[PDB]
Each structure stands twice: as C-alpha cells, then as structure tokens.
Design a protein around this nucleic acid. Structure first.
Lengths: 66, 66
DNA sequence: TTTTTTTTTTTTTTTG
C-alpha cells in the first residue's frame, strides 16, 4: 500500500521477509520509463513508527517555534 | 530540536537556509568520534509532514491488512 | 553515510 505525501514522495506499508516496514521515501523515473525507489528515504520498524507518532505534538511545537 | 525514535534514529526539526525541515534520519559515528547524519533518511517540508500525519489512520490500517 | 524542502535531473535503484 502506498500513500502519497508529495509529488514523488510516499509512505508505504509492506511486509519485508516477515518484518513490517513503514517507508517514507522519494521515487524517481529511470531511463527505461520505470518508477524506482530513490536514495532519499527511510524504512521504519514498528517501534520507530510508534515513537514518531507519539512525538508528533512535540515535533509540531518545534516547527511552530521556528 | 531532535526527537529520538530509535537506537540511532531521530526526527529533527531545524531551519535550513530559511526553510523548515522535518528530517527523519539515521545517524552514525565517524572515525574521529563525531556523531553525524547518515545516508538513510529524508527531509520533509511542512507540507509533506502535514500529508503524512493526515494519512496515519490509513497507514496503520494497511499494516493490519498485511 | 558526511542530511539538508522546492528543482527543470540533482543523476538515486527501499528493506531495524
């Protein structure tokens, strides 16, 4: 499953060899016309995703002060 | 501001060249003993961060439907 | 690894 957050950026959910991964990644279009994952991105495990969500408020507060 | 979400992972909020960035990244330690941002990561603008939050419910649903 | 939005390539090819 893919969820768009930018023109060429998505959050994807997948089971990778038995591990749940939540990837936040940029994608590109290659010379052959194929959509490919980019070097910019990161794949979060369950606990990392859980902690990201738990601190959304603190993250937004930080953004706001900027 | 940095918000830890994993052993070597954080969501950092900073201003870069007058731009607010929400970076989800893995860090590492170099040969001189300095902690540095790593290659695995992605810097989101406030807009992308907003779209990520809006789809958390859908993301978690996809995790369950795996 | 050496971050770093947006980019029109900038030149990648996911996976704790």
């Amino acid at each position: 499953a893919m969820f768009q957050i930018g023109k060429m950026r998505y959050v994807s959910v997948r089971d990778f060899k038995g591990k749940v991964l939540i990837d936040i990644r940029e994608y590109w279009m290659d010379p052959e016309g194929e959509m490919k994952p980019g070097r910019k991105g990161i794949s979060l495990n369950p606990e990392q995703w859980s902690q990201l969500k738990e601190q959304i408020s603190d993250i937004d507060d930080a953004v706001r002060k900027l």
